[PDB]
Amino acid sequence: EKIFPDILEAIRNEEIIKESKKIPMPYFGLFALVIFDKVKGSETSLYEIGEEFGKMLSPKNIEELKKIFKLMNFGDLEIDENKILLKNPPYKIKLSNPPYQWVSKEEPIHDFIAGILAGCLEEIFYYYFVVNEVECVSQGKDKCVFEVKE
Amino acid sequence: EKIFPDILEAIRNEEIIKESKKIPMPYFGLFALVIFDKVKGSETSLYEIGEEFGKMLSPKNIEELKKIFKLMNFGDLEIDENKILLKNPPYKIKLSNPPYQWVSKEEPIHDFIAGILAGCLEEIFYYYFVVNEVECVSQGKDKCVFEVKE
Ligand SMILES: [Ca+2]
Ligand SMILES: [Ca+2]
Ligand SMILES: [Ca+2]
Ligand SMILES: [Ca+2]
Ligand SMILES: [Cl-]
Ligand SMILES: [Cl-]
Ligand SMILES: [Zn+2]
Ligand SMILES: [Zn+2]
């Protein structure tokens, strides 16, 4: 599309993000649903799209990863940097006040966000992670909990 | 995805839309850009996705089409119902305060919105329209102007 050049600049410009229109999450999620209906005739997943999305956000450090989530309005990420610098995986990342708080489901629903975390983390630390959501607000928990490996 | 059932209910529930998190448009547009990078190995367009998106919004009348655009935060649509009931196409629809007001481009940029209008209009009047954006805020105009045919 013709608008795509302008989008990569926009995500680097915090003033554009702050001054831009804000769209309710449901419509955001409708977009994905509609495409996946015209992706199927071919196959990717939402985790994988999140991985590419987080690559593209390319945060500089964990603090910028936290700020980008607040900008996006995806909630408050808890990440222990001190543990990340020093200790070995698994790491654990919590997400408070995430999108789709109104959804009730047996299994965790934030696959897209898990991928985002995976791709942002490789952009910061320059090696590949896999991120798996093991608890979710969807199950009546207070926070989403994501285990981070490799 | 597992979240997709909940999305169709959400877009029918105005309280969910009102209470949900609001995401800056740039991130919304990044999502599309990232998918289209994993759609290409196959081919649709953004107009066509908008057509399907507007089908899915399925507004009841033109007034609900205006309210849905305000809910979504895609701006103030001007549509003359009196002309639409009586007279023959072309119709003209204006959009004030649309998304991507910060983008500057020679050709109009709201292809996705043009499709949305096309699909919402067939959901209201039960026959097919084609909608073409002929002026855009991207060109320094005050409003986006869309011509509606068939
Ligand atoms: Ca990299
Ligand atoms: Ca890089
Ligand atoms: Ca129909
Ligand atoms: Ca219908
Ligand atoms: Cl939400
Ligand atoms: Cl915007
Ligand atoms: Zn979750
Ligand atoms: Zn326009």
The DSSP letter of residue A99 is S
Query: In 3-state terms, what secondary structure has residue B74?
Result: coil
DSSP states along B78-140: E--HHHHHSSPSPEEEEEES-S-TT---SS---HHHHHHHHHHHHHHHSS--EEEEEE-GGGT
With CB atoms and an 8 Å threshold, state whether B21 touches A99. yes
Experimental approach taken = X-ray
| Beta pairing, strands A130-135 & A22-24 | unpaired
Q: How far apart are CA B64 and CA B14, in angstroms?
A: 12
Q: Give, in order, the Cα–Cα distances in Å from B125 to each of A17, A33, B59, B130.
A: 37, 24, 10, 13
**The amino acid at B16:** I
> For this experimental structure, what is the resolution in angstroms?
2.3
Six token digits for residue B20: 């949900």
Give how far A71 is from chain B: nearest CA, Å: 8
| Residue A66: C-alpha distances to residues A134, A137, B41, B97 (Å) | 20, 19, 33, 30
Strand order in the sheet with B130-135: B76-78, B91-96, B144-149, B130-135
Which of A10, A48, A14, A54 shows the shortest CA–CA distance to A32? A48
Distance (Å, whole) CA B24 – CA B97: 15
The total of structural domains in chain B comes to: 1
Q: Domain holding B45: CATH number?
A: 3.30.1380.20
Task: Take residue B126 and report the two structure tokens written for it.
Answer: 């039960």
- B140/chain A closest Cα distance in angstroms: 16
Q: Which residues of B touch A3 (CB under 8 A)?
A: 29, 100, 103, 105, 109, 111
Residue of A14, A89, A105 lying closest to B102 (CA atoms): A14
Classified as helix, coil or strand, A146 is strand
Instruction: Using CB atoms, pick whichever of B10, B53, B72 lies closest to residue A34.
Output: B53
A24: containing domain: 1-150
For residue B113, give how far its alpha carbon lies from the nearest alpha carbon of chain A (Å): 12
Query: Dmax over Cα atoms in chain B, in whole Å?
Result: 45
Residues with their C more than 2.5 Å from the N of the next written residue in chain B, i.e. before a break, are 40
Secondary structure of A24-59 in the HEC alphabet? EHHHHHHHHHHHHHHHCCCCCCHHHHHHHHHHHHCC
Query: How many whole angstroms separate alpha carbon A101 and alpha carbon A137?
Result: 6
Tally of residues, chain A: 150
How many whole angstroms from A52 Cα to the centroid of ligand 2?
A: 12
Asked if A102 and B16 come within 8 Å (Cβ–Cβ), the reply is yes
Contact across the interface for A52 and B37, Cβ inside 8 Å: yes
Tokens of A132: 């798996």
A88: Cβ contacts below 8 Å, ≥ 6 apart: none
Beta-sheet strands, E only, within chain A: 22-24, 76-78, 91-96, 130-135, 144-149
Contact B107 A2 (CB under 8 A): yes
Residue owning tokens 């701006």: B75
Number of H helices and E strands in chain A, helices first, is 7, 5
User: In sequence order, what are the residues at sequence separation of 6 or more whose Cβ sits closer than 8 angstroms to the Cβ of residue B63?
Assistant: B81
